[PDB]
Ligand binder design. Structure first.
Ligand SMILES: [Zn+2]
Lengths: 123, 25, 93, 52, 48, 201, 333
RNA sequence: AAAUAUGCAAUCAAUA
RNA sequence: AAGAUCAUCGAAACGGUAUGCUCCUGAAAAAAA
RNA sequence: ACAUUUAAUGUGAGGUUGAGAUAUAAUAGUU
């Protein structure tokens, strides 16, 4: 409890969960899953700007700094902003935005391979 | 800014729910 | 002699807006010239805003007292274009 | 009469799951009642108040 | 009503009005806190 | 502190002198026309492509690519869409489809509710009191007395922010316009639309 | 100020004028009481307004017009207060200031003296009902054939009755057609063929009581917006860019600006007008996409960014260059 | 004990 | 909120100047080992 | 929700008074 990462209230501003199962992860994992599941997203949608991000579908490429830095650029620091963003203006959870993006992309849940769901927080 | 304030911001992130290291590396 | 009495718009006993627009109170010959020029052009000056009235007054005074080369506007804008826009926005009744 | 087929069964042929239908109806209601602030590019300029 | 200087309306009516007022105040606070921003118009991951 | 040296302009300087003064801020006060706006945008894009680039540009482009991939952009499909200019705006549609009472003796809601708005009065003032144009309506779902599916639809549509569970109350706000009458009309229209959508459940 | 030459300016004349103004204020208060007793509003003013009965509207308008006609014009005040409380209080205050104040303490206690008068206390709770008490409620309900002003409501009802009588002489059908309630909302203005777009004009006072623009009136857009149930951006929702991406962007912008505070209606209109033309004269969105994507690949390689020299090296190394074709003091000396 | 699963500020019960 | 309580790994395992890639603001904090 | 289109749009070509001295034809034909 001294340094437990939930606060006293067990806040999970970055956690996301699937309502179809008990699977849950965070925003960085969601971004990684989105980059890995481009083929499914592109197939559902259906040299070119559309496929420009395909190279990032490789696990080894992402593990390499060449891909890790791209991952960290895409997934910035939602909990870090300007210094004036304090008190009543502290950052809020972007879990809603991430869930909306995932649902619109129709990315599949790793544990149940569903299509929708992916509510905010942790179930 | 100050190292103490940087650590405070990291602790705030941890309380909000982001596991980040406290090492001053 | 003396200034002509103002015409109340509706449900009023006076109107400083008309006197200001005509430049009678406060008296300002440049504003009187602006009013006369806009009336001749066909712009309902009473319907204009204070900002536009002052802008037109300044432009007319500069043109009169410095030459027809002035005023000069950027982006190839012209005083004639400004006058046309004002006329289109506030047709004279 | 008691028809075996239901409207849900008839709709299922197209591929509209009940969960998807519920979510689509909720989203349509929310868009009708609240607005179209979907965070599209350039929406920040329109949502940002002026200060002139 | 009987006592001078006191509100003549029904105490239960006042209770219901107060409960409604408190509920709407809670709703207003929740909505305002959720919608508050320091940089209004900014949404995460949108072109900044 | 002394006089600045005086320079007698040469014939060449006088002959090669601008006949008009440079553009000032007083002139900039005039807004930029859309032609100039578009020309500046085109020039900046052309220069950036020509090579005055930056790492921030690459990062921004990658972020935009991610947004397009998740589908939150205005890009148009080459095969799905490519292979109207006039439309009815949502508020106009709401007004057009709204049903209004024939006379003050007719009620178009039929359920208990309370309407709240704020008005400001005081001595003479030159500045209008801010934050006095919004209005809202509060009601109890139990009083609305709907079926379970309809109640669930209402709660889901209004979200958890507009629902207070302690007393089972629900509130709808409207502060979209600076005029209280306009906000009230919009609030009524949206309340009617919300009830229609709930009944659709 | 010169000594008195004409008795018109003498002090007793001023005292007499103040007394006459106070007498006129008392007469006006008496007339208002008589009007209230002669034409009472059954059930309360608010209930009468909400019910909107012809007799109630007629009685209220008659009483209001009689009060307006009977309201005097005082000599020592240039504010024609419609409230008898305000008129009487101002007259009393003027008299007290003129010939009742010994010192600063009295000049400060004048207001307490006025507030301690029982008649003013009684008149304090007899002012007219401000429009905003019911106008927002009527707008929320959705009443468009309404007016908080009693005289205006009476005028509307009487005009409708006159038009109905013109036909009253397949006849009930024609009478109903002429009746105001049975007029399509789309036909109110040609340019807005949509229903429920026009509302009832608010009776709230508008304008500047005193300034260089005391009688300016409403603005061009304000006059129009005061006559709508609530504003819509249907004016600019046409002739959008033919490019599909730009059309979608402008449509989204219009939809968002319809529901957005902090933006004026004129600002939104001008923004849409400029944006439409900007997109129209810009290049195709797909071409821009291709060019930008080719110029900025996913991974940033070396040498793909313009090299930049240090500021000190570029500038802070002494006088080395001046840009002037015609200068009498070049860098050579 | 078929109750709980437990860290504390600088505003608000005249209303949480 | 921290310094907490409790309970582990544990001594230059201290220190954090320095270092191109990343993030935030803004029209603009660029290049670079 | 029931929702193409007020008239043009040709060359591979996108930069419409140039965002500017200071060695490389580099870029939007070749060089
Ligand atoms: Zn799942």
């Amino acid at each position: 409890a001294a340094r437990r990462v939930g606060g006293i209230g067990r806040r999970c501003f970055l956690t996301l969960h699937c309502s179809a199962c008990s699977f849950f992860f965070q925003t960085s994992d969601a971004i990684k899953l989105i980059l890995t599941q481009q083929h499914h997203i592109l197939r559902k949608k259906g040299a070119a700007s559309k496929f420009s991000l395909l190279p990032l579908a490789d696990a080894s490429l992402l593990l390499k700094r060449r891909g890790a830095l791209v991952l960290r650029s895409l997934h910035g620091d939602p909990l870090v902003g300007s210094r004036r963003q304090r008190g009543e203006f502290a950052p809020q959870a972007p879990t809603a935005e991430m869930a909306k993006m995932l649902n619109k992309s129709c990315v599949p849940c790793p544990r149940c391979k569903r299509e929708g769901r992916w509510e905010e927080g942790k179930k | 800014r100050n190292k103490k304030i940087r650590m405070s911001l990291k602790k705030r992130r941890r309380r909000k729910g982001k596991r980040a290291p406290c090492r001053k590396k | 002699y003396g200034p002509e009495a103002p015409q109340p718009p509706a449900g009023l006993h006076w109107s400083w807006w008309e006197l200001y627009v005509k430049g009678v109170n406060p008296e300002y010959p440049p504003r009187q010239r602006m009013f006369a020029f806009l009336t001749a052009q066909g712009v309902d000056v009473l319907e204009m805003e204070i900002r536009e009235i002052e802008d037109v007054t300044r432009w007319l005074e500069m043109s009169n007292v410095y030459g027809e080369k002035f005023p000069r506007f950027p982006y190839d804008v012209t005083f004639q274009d400004k006058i046309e826009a004002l006329k289109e926005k506030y047709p004279l009744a | 009469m008691r028809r075996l087929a239901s409207p849900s069964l008839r709709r299922l042929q197209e591929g509209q799951t009940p969960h998807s239908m519920r979510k689509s109806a909720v989203a349509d209601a929310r868009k009708k009642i609240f607005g179209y602030a979907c965070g599209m590019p350039g929406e920040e300029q329109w949502v940002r108040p002026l200060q002139g | 009503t009987v006592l001078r200087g006191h509100c003549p309306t029904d105490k239960e009516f006042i209770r219901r009005a107060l409960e409604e007022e408190q509920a709407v105040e809670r709703i207003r606070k929740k909505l305002d806190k959720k919608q508050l921003q320091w940089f209004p118009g900014k949404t995460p991951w949108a072109p900044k | 502190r002394g006089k600045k040296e005086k320079v007698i302009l040469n014939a060449e300087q006088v002959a090669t002198k601008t006949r008009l003064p440079p553009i000032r801020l007083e002139d900039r006060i005039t807004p930029e026309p859309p032609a100039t706006v578009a020309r500046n945008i085109r020039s900046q894009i052309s220069r950036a492509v020509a090579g005055w680039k930056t790492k921030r540009m690459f990062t921004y482009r990658n972020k935009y690519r991610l947004r397009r991939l998740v589908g939150m952009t205005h890009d148009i499909d080459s095969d799905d869409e490519f292979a109207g200019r006039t439309f009815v705006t949502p508020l106009t549609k709401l007004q057009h489809q709204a049903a209004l009472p024939r006379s003050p003796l007719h009620a178009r809601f039929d359920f208990p509710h309370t309407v709240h708005y704020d008005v400001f009065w005081g001595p003479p003032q030159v500045e209008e009191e801010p934050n006095k144009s919004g209005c809202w309506v509060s009601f109890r779902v139990a009083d609305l007395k709907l079926s379970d599916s309809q109640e669930q639809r209402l709660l889901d549509i209004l979200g958890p922010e507009r629902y207070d569970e302690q007393t089972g109350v629900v509130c709808l706000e409207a502060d979209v316009f600076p005029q209280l009458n306009h906000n009230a009309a919009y609030l009524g229209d949206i309340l009617q639309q919300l009830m229609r959508e709930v009944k659709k459940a | 100020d010169h000594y008195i030459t004409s008795a018109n300016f003498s002090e007793p004349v001023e005292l007499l004028s103040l007394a006459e103004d106070l007498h006129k204020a008392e007469i006006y208060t008496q007339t208002t009481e008589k009007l209230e007793k002669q034409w009472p509003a059954a059930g309360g003013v608010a209930k009468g307004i909400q019910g909107d009965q012809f007799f109630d509207v007629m009685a209220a308008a008659v009483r209001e017009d009689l009060q307006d006609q009977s309201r005097p014009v005082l000599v020592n005040e240039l504010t024609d207060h419609e409230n008898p409380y305000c008129m009487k209080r101002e007259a009393l205050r003027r008299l007290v200031l003129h010939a009742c104040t010994r010192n600063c303490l009295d000049e400060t206690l004048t207001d307490t003296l006025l507030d301690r008068r029982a008649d003013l206390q009684r008149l304090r709770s007899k002012a007219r009902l401000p429009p905003e008490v019911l106008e927002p409620l009527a707008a929320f309900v959705g009443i468009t054939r309404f007016s908080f002003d009693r005289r205006a409501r009476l005028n509307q009802k009487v005009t409708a009755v006159q038009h109905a009588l013109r036909q009253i002489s397949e006849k009930v059908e024609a009478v109903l057609s002429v009746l105001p309630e049975n007029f399509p909302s789309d036909a109110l203005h040609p340019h807005h063929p949509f229903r429920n777009h026009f509302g009832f004009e608010s009776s709230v006072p508008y304008g500047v009581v005193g300034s260089i623009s005391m009688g300016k009136g409403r603005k061009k857009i304000e006059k129009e917006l005061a006559r709508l149930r609530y504003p819509t951006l249907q004016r600019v929702a046409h002739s959008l860019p033919k490019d599909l991406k730009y059309r979608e962007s402008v449509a989204h912008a219009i939809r968002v600006l319809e529901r957005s505070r902090g933006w004026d209606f004129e600002s939104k209109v001008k923004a849409i007008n400029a944006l439409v033309e900007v997109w129209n004269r810009l290049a195709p969105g797909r071409t821009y996409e291709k060019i930008l994507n080719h110029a900025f690949p996913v991974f940033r390689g070396r040498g793909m960014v313009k090299k930049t020299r240090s500021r000190a090296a570029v500038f802070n190394k002494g006088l080395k260059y001046i840009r002037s074709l015609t200068t009498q003091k070049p860098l050579h000396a």
